[PDB]
Enzyme design. Structure first.
Site, short mmCIF file in Angstrom:
data_model
loop_
_atom_site.label_atom_id
_atom_site.label_comp_id
_atom_site.label_asym_id
_atom_site.label_seq_id
_atom_site.Cartn_x
_atom_site.Cartn_y
_atom_site.Cartn_z
N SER A 1 6.95 2.53 6.74
CA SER A 1 6.08 1.04 6.56
C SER A 1 6.99 0.72 5.22
CB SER A 1 5.08 1.50 5.88
OG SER A 1 4.70 2.44 5.36
N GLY A 2 7.20 -0.95 4.97
CA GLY A 2 7.82 -1.79 3.28
C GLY A 2 8.89 -1.89 4.09
N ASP B 1 0.48 -7.55 2.77
CA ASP B 1 1.59 -7.04 2.41
C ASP B 1 2.63 -6.11 2.14
OD1 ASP B 1 1.38 -3.34 2.53
OD2 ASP B 1 0.46 -3.79 3.79
N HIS C 1 0.75 -1.35 0.15
CA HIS C 1 0.01 0.08 0.13
C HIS C 1 0.87 1.25 0.28
CE1 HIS C 1 -2.77 -3.04 1.63
NE2 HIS C 1 -2.73 -3.24 2.35
O1 J56 Z 1 1.86 7.29 4.71
C1 J56 Z 1 3.11 7.34 4.53
N1 J56 Z 1 4.07 7.86 4.23
C2 J56 Z 1 4.50 9.13 4.79
C3 J56 Z 1 3.50 9.49 5.28
C4 J56 Z 1 3.68 9.98 5.86
C5 J56 Z 1 4.77 11.06 6.54
C6 J56 Z 1 5.95 9.72 6.12
BR1 J56 Z 1 7.72 10.09 6.63
N2 J56 Z 1 5.88 8.77 5.59
C7 J56 Z 1 3.22 5.58 3.90
S1 J56 Z 1 2.90 5.16 2.45
C8 J56 Z 1 0.79 5.24 2.34
C9 J56 Z 1 1.16 4.08 3.65
N3 J56 Z 1 2.28 4.59 4.85
C10 J56 Z 1 2.41 4.35 5.98
O2 J56 Z 1 3.45 5.08 6.42
C11 J56 Z 1 1.37 3.50 6.67
N4 J56 Z 1 1.52 3.17 7.90
N5 J56 Z 1 1.80 2.61 8.46
C12 J56 Z 1 1.77 2.76 9.24
C13 J56 Z 1 1.19 3.60 10.16
C14 J56 Z 1 0.96 4.68 10.95
C15 J56 Z 1 -0.41 5.60 11.13
C16 J56 Z 1 -0.71 6.01 9.90
C17 J56 Z 1 -0.44 5.35 8.70
C18 J56 Z 1 0.90 3.96 8.70
#
Ligand code: J56
Length: 228
Positions: free
Chosen positions: A183-184, A89, A41
């Site tokens: 994430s990733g 995922d 995602h």
């Molecule tokens: O949201 C994402 N990236 C992101 C956003 C703001 C700041 C920074 Br650095 N990176 C990525 S791309 C879409 C999914 N993502 C996640 O990080 C998902 N995710 N993974 C953990 C998590 C915790 C809270 C909210 C979202 C969360």
């Protein structure tokens, strides 16, 4: 990374930054010379834009000799992945050309034997994800050492209520955790890739909601199939 230290510059050559329009989105791990393993995602809310993998970095902004941007030639998501679930995922990204290997760019050997990481094992999760609840984006790579939490505790109703499958694993989340943008990213135990930070929207820093990581050994045949 919440409650962690700044990483030692280029101590983790496998580390990758999945970026869209020069902004970091997700962490990634170099699993082969031309392949980077990430979360399914990461490229979801993505608009019309340039998706690139940054290798050889410590600082996202500052120039480094080791730093090199690569174009994504092929983005292979897991067939059974869905936006609605954190299951399967995984996403394999093939770079435009083979990565220029050096002391700062080296693929990480990933676990092929499907054995659960012993609860209590101290694992290292690194990334350029938010460092506070205010959402401060770090410029330099951050990391934290989290102990593996047993699935039974993780699946409690107070915790993830059976959401943690035999294909998923957990780590403690008391203040020290992984978060948005981590994430990733990789979860390394004994210098071997064991897990991949999920790209599912969760709530970081709370001990009652542990960190969720996709077990790579659980998807070993798929990875092998794609990389071949
Ligand atoms: O949201 C994402 N990236 C992101 C956003 C703001 C700041 C920074 Br650095 N990176 C990525 S791309 C879409 C999914 N993502 C996640 O990080 C998902 N995710 N993974 C953990 C998590 C915790 C809270 C909210 C979202 C969360």
């Amino acid at each position: 990374i919440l409650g962690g230290r700044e990483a030692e510059a280029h101590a983790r050559p496998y580390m990758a930054s999945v970026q869209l329009n020069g902004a970091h989105l997700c962490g990634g791990v170099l699993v082969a010379e031309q392949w980077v393993l990430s979360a399914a995602h990461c490229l979801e809310d993505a608009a019309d834009g340039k998706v690139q993998v940054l290798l050889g970095a410590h600082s996202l902004s500052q120039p480094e000799p080791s730093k090199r941007l690569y174009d994504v030639l092929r983005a292979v998501p897991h067939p059974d992945s869905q936006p609605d679930t954190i299951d399967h995922d995984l996403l394999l990204l093939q770079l435009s050309e083979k990565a220029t290997l050096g002391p700062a760019v080296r693929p990480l050997p990933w676990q092929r034997v499907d054995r659960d990481v012993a609860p209590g094992t101290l694992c290292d999760v690194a990334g350029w994800g938010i460092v506070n609840h205010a959402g401060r984006r770090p410029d330099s790579l951050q990391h934290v050492l989290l102990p593996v939490l047993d699935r039974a505790t993780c699946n409690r109703r107070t915790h993830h209520d059976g959401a943690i499958t035999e294909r998923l694993m957990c780590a403690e989340s008391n203040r020290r955790d992984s978060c948005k943008g981590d994430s990733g990213g990789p979860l390394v135990c004994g210098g071997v890739l064991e897990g991949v930070v999920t790209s599912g929207s969760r709530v970081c820093g709370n001990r009652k909601k542990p960190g969720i990581y996709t077990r790579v050994a659980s998807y070993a045949a798929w990875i092998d199939s794609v990389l071949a």
